[PDB]
From a paper:
The DNA sliding clamp proliferating cell nuclear antigen (PCNA) is an essential co-factor for many eukaryotic DNA metabolic enzymes. PCNA is loaded around DNA by the ATP-dependent clamp loader replication factor C (RFC), which acts at single-stranded (ss)/double-stranded DNA (dsDNA) junctions harboring a recessed 3’ end (3’ ss/dsDNA junctions) and at DNA nicks. RFC is composed of four small AAA+ subunits, Rfc2-5, and one large AAA+ subunit, Rfc1, which assemble head-to-tail into a two-tiered partially open ring structure. To illuminate the loading mechanism we have investigated the structure of RFC:PCNA bound to ATPγS and 3’ ss/dsDNA junctions or nicked DNA using cryogenic electron microscopy.
To visualize PCNA loading at DNA nicks, we assembled and collected cryo-EM images of RFC:PCNA in complex with a 50 base-pair nicked dsDNA substrate. Image analysis revealed open and closed states at resolutions from 2.4 to 2.7 Å. Among these classes were open and closed states in which the nicked DNA was coordinated with one double-stranded segment in the central chamber at site 1 and the second double-stranded segment between the AAA+ and collar domains at site 3 connected by a single-stranded region. Moreover, both double-stranded regions of nicked DNA are melted and the 3’ and 5’ overhangs bind to the same residues of RFC as do the 3’ and 5’ overhangs of the 3’ ss/dsDNA junctions that bind to RFC at sites 1 and 3, respectively. Thus, RFC employs the same mechanism to load PCNA onto nicked DNA and 3’ ss/dsDNA junctions.
Numbering used by the authors:
A (entry chain C): 7 to 336
B (entry chain A): 460 to 786
C (entry chain B): 4 to 321
D (entry chain E): 1 to 354
E (entry chain D): 11 to 353
DNA sequence: TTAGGGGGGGGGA
DNA sequence: CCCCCCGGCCCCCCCGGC
DNA sequence: CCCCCCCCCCTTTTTTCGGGGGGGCCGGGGGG
């Protein structure tokens, strides 16, 4: 902890103010309007991993209280003990007692509340209601099915969407400016494509790419660097493999698949995912083709998830695609 | 209940059954005339059926309704019965009877008794319902057979779904503790298999025999383990190999000689037992493992009592070797 | 700003029985009891946010008046309610000597009684019977089946049903008139539609929309309350072509951030209650959805698995 | 006295008589045993895997490996349950069967094996090279029955503590063994003895035991009926000699195990009658077999291979039977209650046959 | 009695070749440059992120992490800076909440002057959760905030074989490194070096055959090479190891038996196939190897049409999946052969 | 529509 | 110096979907 | 009185992790 430059990029670039959170304009604007007018309700932030829920709530707490927010808010998470006993004593006294420093209201942040037991959630029901005059509750979640209906009924819900392309591009530009790095346009497109709307993945991949360059100052990150560091198939490889499977014979298709996979040690699962993505845009005459493709490829992916023989799995992928595409003729 | 097992045969067991309507009709009429409200005697039976014979609940219902509704008649009996209808969970036998009824699986029955109700019926006792279904799904005259489908085919489909439900049950009770899969099990173990053989019970509803058989298997496996580790130093095999290969041969050197040489085979049998560090209890346990044509109960019983007494006397009047020294 | 505006759910919480909407017969019976007295042991059951705790508190207040402080013992899930508490605190409260009006009795409120352990419920049985002449018990719960039968036998039953859209509209209009909220008819219709019979949710959504957008119309209301995902899942499962179902899955659920586990659980729940479809077809769909859920729980929560589940469901109906 | 199957067991590598190539390979392994890797011996049951493992241990350490003792070890679970494990130990090696504790077998790997591996060899066990031995051998019998958690726990123990312990795992099939464990072991195939070798061994036993054989054809018949199982062959030879007054004739019948007879009766019952009442009756036979320590997998295998031997069935019936057998074998491997899967398999076979 | 303690070099000189030739530094890793370069750059960047190593068995994950720790902290400071937990240790939610968290919260051990002068000594410690795929979902979730809150003084490394077993939040929090399979094109140099240092004499292509048989596992190849060397030394004939000996030691079915099986399948008679398979299982051949060889023969044969190959690919996939669950080999092999015979 | 079999108790030729 | 009180490990039994 | 009919009520018990509750010793502290 000598300096912030020793931290991983995922933690070094954590937003500190609500203005540094990108891709959630609606939620940020609404929460800022609520806070400015002094009408903050009980909040629920539901979203997928790496969307900016924890960062957003921390920034909101820092804005409401300031630099010493950590001593004014009760933050609990899965790493801590959050049983019914903790709800009955710690949270209850925190909600029923005044602030030590200032004379404002009190904030309780239950991050990863989906990991809380049902008994604790039930106990929190009356805690939220009785002390609503001076206490506010924030619940952060990735899975809504783990939250009891009673708890959901007491909170106003905000959905964090997958990060749009523009926000990721702006954050990448900021990171490049800070790190004195050069990124190619195709490299940026590939980086955004493989992120799936997760900023942590983008930051980790960019940090890995910087370490790959021999001279990070005078060198630029190209699509080749991104593909090599992550060990992911290139679009050309996927196109060639699919074309060989769809138009060539069994021997040629098998040879092409093995040659493409051995040149860079590609993983079969990545090729399957890329081919599925490519085929999702195909206009097929018969629904049987789509049904067979989806079912057989899902079965192959499930089998791969448990190991098995790689060569047999690749042959199964080839055969499944070939048989499924035979329904497009009659 | 299991917790009441110790009270099996230590007290005089007296049973109080649900009171009949006639025995309480006079008291209800007296209470009604005393409380000054009008109740039609004909709706009494409906109220008593609503509470399942609970007199206290009947009196509470009267007290509550009389506050505003001063007349209890056929004009409002249905609403009162529905509002105050006790929701008591069924017992394994009742659950099995209702689940295996074809009426609820028909279009009208399905629209009346919905799939959610069927799933909830399983949750009345989720530990015994699948066992009852597996026990009683072969003892029905089905009324839901599809055209061209025989009873055996539906039985086979139900058995396949029961196997899948068993796999799901194994998944649930693992280290992962995937209890969120409990509802799916309900469909795979009770609802779907029942829907394939639902009909009229072709006999009496029996209690699951898997539990007693599992206990018997555990006892026999414990005995086999003790015997294998008693004979471990002399045999090169595992417990399964001992049961499947060694024991039949040991039968021809431990019990058969007594049937041919009479009481003159005690010495050889004792020598063989000592060579494998076997005890008399080990002998008895061995002789209980054989199955089918090799059952020994009658064979051992037919041995003269003098032979068995001499065997016991000779065994108890000698120093035998010990294999495992517990210290 | 370090100030908080009081939520309308608390600012406008009913304080008398006459201000509660829905369940007219039950509320009338409660008023009659509050008038005559002789309150019996009761258990109030219903779905969340319909006015059970409010009704219990209003009845207790209307019955006890200035004695509320000493004649009411309120316990909920946030307080310790073990067997020791029942045997010591509740017993002491029941045995306490308190002079009350001629036809009044002490009240023990047990909110969310469905969370109590079986031991405490068993212990309460004789306490209720031996002190019924001075104390009465009112339980409030969501699942009445979790209360042991011996306790249910000693208490009256009051089951609360969903509030009709008319009652929700009435209360929302009263609050709007008491708050000078600018609204449009479509906005109130959307609020009622998303509320799904929950008064608390409706009021919270209205307050959030007013504080965030000002004008309560359909557009602003839908910017605060998102479209219920169970209905989107039902549309996905009822689609005719596989392409339409896959489009619904991709555009409305997957790209919006909904997790695969949530999607599969909602699909199972919706399929379990799809009366339009025959029971056998629903059973096959449930088997397929259970296979997909088992695959997801093992770690493979990919979009391909959901697409395969949809393809299998469509194949079942073909 | 001691059964011939146990009285004539070889106790050295030079005493082996079948699969000479395997003997040569084992001798090559024993030439310089200091760098001996972990061993996994796989092959058909009853072929002599344990005998060859003991012979290898004797060659590495000496005859003292055959001086065996039995002790008891206590273990405590997370629920405070007390479990007992019987440990067979010698001055140079330790034999364990963790599957005796079922799902608790992991603890045996976590505590006992860890304790043994975290202890270096200090006793002066002078070897043939003139320097003392440095590792103790551990024999995990029935390694195929280990749960995946126990196998995962075994992974790092074999690597970090390879200088103190060398593991020898004997199994009948490598399918249940996880790939990481198979990667950490040297796999040794143990083919079953040929019929001629079995006949030679049986003739040697006959000569030593003074048994009057009318002809050598009886030994060939016994070997052919054992399907390569030498233990079964020897025990059947002993059984056939105690029913004919220690004199075997050409007309002496082959004795089958009782459970085999029950399974054949079940097969005939299934073939003759295909009905729900027949399935109910077969359920009783299945429960009876399972209650006397007859494994479900063995029952399924024997039933499948007895049904396929029926001469009145056509090719389609046999194909359906084998497909259902594969499916329900997978179900048994992935299930807990074996009776459910067995009943399902029998019902499907009855449906297909009828 | 007692025995004099052995030296580290002497002890290592008598260990199995897999442990004897384990990589000692990051430069000894053979075919993981795409990640090894990134890890090596952190010795100067001093910003090591949270790492998630995943890949097939025997690819060099544990060796890579151990070498990285040794290079970062050195022989003396490594012990106080590393906390290793694997599948052989209790790793429940309670352990994560108390032991792992307590270690993470602890201040980094004070480096000595020698360590600071000779090693980079980054200002953080490392927690290595080997075989993390065996941990329950709740325990994994318990690590989410511990990873981020105390990242200033602690870094986490999760090593697994099945990436799908890691909950999505942990994978997102960790930078992912995929270890590629080691084949004859990227691992021949290491095997050749090992053979040369062991004075192992083999014919041309023997090492390539060993690596092809290993199927991505270098540990298996090294063990097989050691077995072949031991056999050759026991024979004492001075001749070079041959590919047939390697195949015999690896359990590969002879080509003649494969041709006999293929001919039996071609015949199509159920009884003959059953009898031949019953005789075949008596030799102890592993079903997985037989299935792999059948796949290699059929898929690469020009004497078969497209439909036959399409069907046989799915048949082989189903058989392999069923075998991967720990099923009886005899029944599965018979079913596969019967199904192929009826194609 | 009532699974089969045993125990309770009011009515009655 | 010894008795009473009352907080703190250990232990054992019961749920687990909605 | 035995006989008849109807109705109600009984057949019977196995287990992988984590959390919560309830009872029992134990030992530290205060006090006389
Ligand atoms: N909207 C965003 N704008 C900028 N950076 C972001 C954003 N969302 C995530 N990040 C980056 O990702 C890191 C982690 O963000 P978090 O908000 O903690 O993840 P998360 O949304 O909480 O995911 P879960 O639900 O906890 S798994 C931050 O420190 C940023 O570097
Ligand atoms: N019938 C009703 N009439 C008017 N307002 C109501 C009604 N029901 C609920 N509300 C409002 O919603 C708030 C919460 O209702 P409560 O009755 O306290 O919750 P609830 O019905 O007990 O739900 P559960 O089961 O306890 S989670 C009240 O304070 C009112 O503002
Ligand atoms: N990349 C590599 N370079 C050199 N030797 C290697 C490499 N990978 C594996 N080995 C050898 O194989 C042995 C075992 O390697 P490990 O890294 O422990 O296996 P692994 O990658 O951890 O497989 P898992 O996932 O633990 S089953 C090492 O001691 C080396 O002898
Ligand atoms: N080389 C041999 N010569 C004579 N008998 C043998 C030989 N190998 C094995 N046997 C006999 O076969 C029987 C079974 O062998 P076993 O050790 O159980 O093999 P596995 O370990 O494969 O089951 C033993 O009782 C032994 O007497
Ligand atoms: Mg977060
Ligand atoms: Mg309340
Ligand atoms: Mg490793």
């Amino acid at each position: 902890k000598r300096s912030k430059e020793n931290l991983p990029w995922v933690e070094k670039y954590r937003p500190e103010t609500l203005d540094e959170v990108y891709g959630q304009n609606e939620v940020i604007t609404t929460v800022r309007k609520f806070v400015d007018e002094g009408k903050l309700p009980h909040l629920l932030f539901y979203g997928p991993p790496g969307t900016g829920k924890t960062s957003t709530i921390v920034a909101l707490a820092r804005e409401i209280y300031g630099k010493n927010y950590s001593n004014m808010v009760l933050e609990l998470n899965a790493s801590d003990d959050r049983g019914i006993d903790v709800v009955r004593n710690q949270i209850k006294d925190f909600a029923s007692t005044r602030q030590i420093f200032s004379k404002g209201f009190k904030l309780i942040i239950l991050d990863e509340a989906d990991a809380m037991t049902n008994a604790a959630q039930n106990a929190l029901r009356r805690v939220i209601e009785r002390y609503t005059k001076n206490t506010r509750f924030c619940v952060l979640a990735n899975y809504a099915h783990k939250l009891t209906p009673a708890l959901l009924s007491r909170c106003t819900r905000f959905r964090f969407q997958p990060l749009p392309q523009e926000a990721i591009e702006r954050r990448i530009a900021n990171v490049l400016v800070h790190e004195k790095l050069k990124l190619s346009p195709n490299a940026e497109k590939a980086l955004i494509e493989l992120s799936n709307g997760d900023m942590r993945r983008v930051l980790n991949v960019l940090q890995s790419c910087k370490a790959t360059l021999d001279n990070p100052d005078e060198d630029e990150i190209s699509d080749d660097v991104i593909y090599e560091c992550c060990g992911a198939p290139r679009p050309s490889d996927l196109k060639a493999v699919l074309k060989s499977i769809l138009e060539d014979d069994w021997g040629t298709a098998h040879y092409t698949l093995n040659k493409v996979r051995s040149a860079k040690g590609l993983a079969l699962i990545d090729l399957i995912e890329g081919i599925v993505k490519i085929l999702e845009d195909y206009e097929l005459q018969n629904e049987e083709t789509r049904v067979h493709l989806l079912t057989k490829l899902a079965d192959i992916e499930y089998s791969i998830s448990k190991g098995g023989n790689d060569q047999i799995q690749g042959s199964a992928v080839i055969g499944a695609i070939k048989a499924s595409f035979e329904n497009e003729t009659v | 209940l299991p917790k009441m097992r110790p009270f099996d045969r230590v007290c005089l067991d007296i049973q109080f059954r649900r009171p009949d309507a006639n025995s309480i009709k006079s008291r209800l009429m007296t209470i009604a005339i005393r409380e000054k409200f009008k109740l039609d005697p004909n709706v009494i039976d409906r109220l008593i059926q609503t509470t399942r014979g609970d007199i206290r609940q009947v009196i509470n219902l009267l007290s509550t309704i009389s506050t505003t509704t001063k007349t209890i008649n056929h004009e409002n009996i249905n609403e009162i019965s529905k509002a105050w209808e006790k929701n008591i969970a069924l017992k394994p036998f009742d659950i099995a009877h209702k689940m295996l009824d074809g009426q609820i699986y028909s279009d009208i029955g399905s629209r009346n008794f919905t799939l959610n109700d069927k799933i909830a019926l399983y949750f009345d006792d989720f530990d015994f319902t699948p066992l009852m279904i597996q026990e009683n799904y072969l003892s029905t005259r089905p009324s839901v057979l599809k055209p061209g489908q025989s009873h055996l085919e539906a039985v086979a489909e139900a058995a396949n779904c029961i196997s899948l439900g068993d796999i799901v049950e194994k998944k649930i009770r693992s280290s992962e503790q995937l209890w969120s899969l409990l509802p799916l099990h309900a469909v795979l173990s009770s609802v779907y298999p029942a829907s394939k053989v639902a009909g009229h019970m072709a006999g009496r509803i029996n209690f699951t025999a898997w539990l007693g058989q599992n206990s018997k298997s555990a006892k026999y496996y414990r005995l086999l383990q003790e015997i294998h580790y008693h004979t471990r130093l002399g045999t090169s095999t595992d417990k399964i190999g001992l049961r499947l290969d060694y024991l039949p041969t040991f039968r021809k050197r431990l019990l058969d000689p007594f049937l041919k040489q009479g009481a003159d085979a005690i010495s050889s049998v004792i020598e063989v037992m000592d060579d494998y560090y076997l005890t008399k209890e080990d002998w008895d346990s061995i002789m209980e493992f054989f199955v089918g044509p090799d059952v020994t109960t009658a064979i051992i019983k037919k041995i003269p009592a003098t032979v068995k007494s001499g065997f016991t006397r000779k065994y108890n009047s000698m120093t035998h070797p010990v294999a495992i020294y517990r210290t | 700003t370090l100030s908080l505006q009081l939520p309308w759910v608390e600012k406008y919480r009913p304080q008398v029985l006459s201000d509660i909407v829905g369940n007219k017969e039950t509320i009338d019976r409660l008023q009659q009891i509050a008038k005559d007295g002789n309150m019996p042991h009761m258990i109030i059951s219903g779905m969340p946010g319909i006015g059970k705790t409010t009704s219990v508190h209003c009845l207790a207040h209307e019955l006890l008046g200035r004695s509320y402080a000493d004649g009411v013992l309120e316990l909920n899930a946030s307080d310790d309610r073990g067997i020791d508490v029942v045997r010591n605190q509740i017993k002491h409260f029941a045995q306490k000597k308190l002079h009350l009006p001629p036809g009044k009795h002490k009240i023990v409120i047990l909110d969310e009684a469905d969370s109590m352990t079986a031991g405490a419920q068993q212990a309460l049985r004789r306490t209720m019977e031996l002190y019924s002449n001075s104390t009465r018990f009112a339980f409030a719960c969501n699942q009445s089946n979790k209360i042991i039968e011996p306790l249910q036998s000693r208490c009256a039953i009051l089951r609360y049903s969903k509030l009709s859209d008319e009652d929700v509209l009435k209360r929302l209009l009263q609050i709007i008139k008491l708050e000078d909220v600018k609204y449009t008819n479509d906005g109130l219709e959307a609020i009622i539609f998303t509320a799904e019979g929950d008064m608390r949710q409706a009021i919270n959504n209205l307050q959030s929309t007013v504080a965030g957008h000002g004008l309560v119309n359909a557009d602003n209301v839908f910017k605060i309350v998102d479209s219920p995902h169970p209905l989107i899942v039902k549309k996905m499962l009822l689609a005719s072509n596989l392409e339409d179902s896959i489009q619904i899955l991709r555009t409305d659920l997957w790209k919006k951030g909904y997790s695969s586990i949530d999607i599969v659980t909602t699909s199972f729940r919706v399929t379990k209650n799809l009366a339009q479809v025959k029971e056998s077809v629903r059973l096959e769909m449930i088997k397929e959805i259970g296979l997909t859920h088992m695959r997801i729980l093992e770690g493979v929560g990919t979009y391909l698995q959901l697409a395969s589940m949809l393809a299998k469901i469509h194949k079942l109906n073909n | 006295m001691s059964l011939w199957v146990d009285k004539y067991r070889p106790k050295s590598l030079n005493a082996l008589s079948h699969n000479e190539e395997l003997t040569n390979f084992l001798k090559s392994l024993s030439d310089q045993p200091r760098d001996l890797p972990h061993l996994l011996l796989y092959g058909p049951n009853g072929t002599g895997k344990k005998t060859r493992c003991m012979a290898l241990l004797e060659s590495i350490f000496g005859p003292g490996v055959y001086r065996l003792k039995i002790d008891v070890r206590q273990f405590v679970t997370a629920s405070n349950r007390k479990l007992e494990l019987n440990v067979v130990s010698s001055p140079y090696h330790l034999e364990i069967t963790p599957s005796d504790m079922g799902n608790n077998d992991r603890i045996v790997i976590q505590e006992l094996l860890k304790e043994v591996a975290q202890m270096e060899q200090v006793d002066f066990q002078d070897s043939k090279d003139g320097l003392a031995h440095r590792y103790k051998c551990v024999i995990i019998n029935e390694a195929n029955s280990l749960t995946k958690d126990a196998q995962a726990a075994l992974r790092r123990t074999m690597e970090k503590y390879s200088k103190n312990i060398r593991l020898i795992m004997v199994c009948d099939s490598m399918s249940p063994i996880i790939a990481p464990i198979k990667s950490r072991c040297l796999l040794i195939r143990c083919p079953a003895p040929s019929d001629s070798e079995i006949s030679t061994i049986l003739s040697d036993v006959v000569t030593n035991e003074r048994i009057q054989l009318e002809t050598k054809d009886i030994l060939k018949r016994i070997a052919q009926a054992s399907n390569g199982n030498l233990r079964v062959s020897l025990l059947m030879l002993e059984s056939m000699a105690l029913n004919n007054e220690l004199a075997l004739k050409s007309s002496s019948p082959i004795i089958k195990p009782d459970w085999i007879i029950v399974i054949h009766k079940l097969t005939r019952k299934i073939v003759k009658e295909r009905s729900v009442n027949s399935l109910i009756e077969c359920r009783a036979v299945l429960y009876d077999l399972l209650a006397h320590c007859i494994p479900a997998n063995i029952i399924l295998k024997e039933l499948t291979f007895s049904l396929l031997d029926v001469e009145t069935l056509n090719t389609t019936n046999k194909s359906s039977i084998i497909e259902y057998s594969s499916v329900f074998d997978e179900r048994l491997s992935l299930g807990n209650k074996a009776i459910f899967h067995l009943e399902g398999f029998i019902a499907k076979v009855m449906c297909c046959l009828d | 009695r007692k025995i004099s303690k052995l030296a580290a070099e002497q002890s290592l000189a008598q260990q199995p070749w897999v442990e004897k030739y384990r990589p000692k530094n990051l430069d000894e890793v053979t075919a993981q440059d795409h990640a090894v370069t990134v890890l090596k750059k952190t010795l100067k960047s001093a910003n090591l992120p949270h790492m998630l190593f995943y890949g097939p068995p025997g690819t060099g994950k544990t060796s890579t992490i151990l070498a990285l720790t040794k290079e970062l902290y050195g022989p003396d400071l490594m012990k106080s800076r590393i906390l290793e937990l694997n599948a052989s240790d209790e790793r429940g939610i309670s352990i994560v909440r108390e032991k792992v968290k307590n270690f993470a919260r602890l201040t980094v051990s004070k480096p000595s002057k020698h360590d600071l002068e000779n090693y980079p000594c980054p200002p953080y410690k490392i927690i290595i959760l080997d075989e993390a795929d065996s941990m329950t979902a709740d325990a994994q979730s318990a690590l989410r905030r511990t990873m981020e809150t105390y990242s200033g003084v602690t870094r986490f490394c999760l090593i697994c074989n099945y990436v799908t077993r890691i909950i999505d939040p942990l994978a997102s929090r960790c930078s992912k490194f995929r270890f590629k399979a080691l084949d004859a094109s990227n691992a021949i140099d290491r095997l050749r070096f090992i053979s040369e240092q062991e004075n192992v004499k083999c014919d041309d292509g023997v090492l390539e055959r060993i690596l092809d048989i290993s199927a991505g596992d270098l540990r298996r190849g090294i063990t097989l090479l050691q077995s072949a060397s031991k056999g050759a030394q026991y024979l004492g004939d001075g001749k070079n190891i041959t590919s047939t000996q390697v195949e015999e030691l690896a359990g590969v079915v002879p080509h003649d038996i494969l041709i006999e099986i293929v001919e039996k399948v071609k015949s199509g008679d159920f009884d003959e196939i059953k009898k031949y398979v019953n005789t075949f299982m008596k030799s102890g051949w592993s079903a997985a190897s037989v299935v792999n060889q059948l796949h290699e023969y059929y898929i690469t044969n020009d004497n078969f049409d497209t439909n036959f190959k399409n069907q046989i690919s799915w048949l082989l996939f189903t058989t392999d999946s069923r075998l991967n669950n720990g099923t009886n080999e005899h029944i599965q092999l018979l079913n596969l052969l019967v199904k192929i015979s009826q194609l």
